[PDB]
Structure 1
Amino acid sequence: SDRPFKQRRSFADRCKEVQQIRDQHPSKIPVIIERYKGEKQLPVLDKTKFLVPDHVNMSELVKIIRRRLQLNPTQAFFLLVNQHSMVSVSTPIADIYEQEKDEDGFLYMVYASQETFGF
């Protein structure tokens, strides 16, 4: 450990949590954001669970993660859905949530450095 969030929290706990936040924060998309597997070059975030305003596009989430990570302009990074799915930056996060959310109700995302993918 640390392991993936899915392995640190039972499915039952994750399902329950999602039901509750959606209840308390109906306009927020619940997002798990973790480092891509074996990624060591980019830093870990202070928090794993994000509450993302549902009217926003992917690009707004990317700009936020970029700022959470404190990357300088020269560092490029990927924000992938699930294991390695590329998501258009003009795509609404509510749409990605609908198509790609887990059975437990979270949307899972991972980030990786350009070096991880050979750039």
Structure 2
Amino acid sequence: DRPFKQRRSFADRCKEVQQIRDQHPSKIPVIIERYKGEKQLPVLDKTKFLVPDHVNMSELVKIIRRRLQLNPTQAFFLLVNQHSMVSVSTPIADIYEQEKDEDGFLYMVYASQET
């Protein structure tokens, strides 16, 4: 239940990304985690996702909203290195090159506020 980086060593995280490059070359390896202090939104069922590289960040927002089963009254923000993604209709492939972690994953955090 701890964050991903506390459950896998840096070496193991790098290895995982390299494996994903071999097995699913057209996908972006993503870690999506609930903000540390979040109180309203539920937890996702899982944290690691393989995203086809053509998916827009703004579509990813709508997909995650559906996966959390949110009403249209529930606020939801998806942040990548503190940047909100709701209006970024750019493919994740381009965000990946810019925002990837040193371990090769693309990390995101979701919250009910955009701080």
**TM-score scaled by length of structure 2:** 0.91
Which digits, 9 at most, give the CA deviation of each residue in 1:56-76, with x for residues without a partner?
111111111001111011112
Preserved CA contact (<8 Å) 1:30 1:51: yes
Which digits, 9 at most, give the CA deviation of each residue in 1:70-101, with x for residues without a partner?
10111121000035555742122111111000
Cα distance change of structure 1 residues 59 and 86 upon mapping to structure 2, 3 Å threshold? closer
Cα distance change of structure 1 residues 60 and 84 upon mapping to structure 2, 3 Å threshold? closer
Which digits, 9 at most, give the CA deviation of each residue in 1:3-43, with x for residues without a partner?
22111111111000000011100111100000012112111
Percent of residue pairs identical: 100
Runs of 4+ more than 2 Å apart: 82-89
Structure 2 residues not aligned, in runs of 5+: none
Once residues 83 and 7 of structure 1 are traced to their aligned partners in structure 2, the CA distance between those partners, rounded to angstroms, is: 20
Preserved CA contact (<8 Å) 1:57 1:89: yes
Cα distance change of structure 1 residues 4 and 58 upon mapping to structure 2, 3 Å threshold? same
Preserved CA contact (<8 Å) 2:31 2:47: yes
Is the partner of 2:84 in helix, strand or coil? Answer: coil
Q: RMSD between aligned alpha carbons?
A: 1.8
Preserved CA contact (<8 Å) 2:33 2:110: yes
Cα distance change of structure 1 residues 83 and 11 upon mapping to structure 2, 3 Å threshold? farther
Cα distance change of structure 1 residues 19 and 115 upon mapping to structure 2, 3 Å threshold? closer
Count of matched residue positions in the alignment of Structure 1 and Structure 2: 115
Which residue matches 2:45? 46
1:4 equivalent to 2:21? Answer no
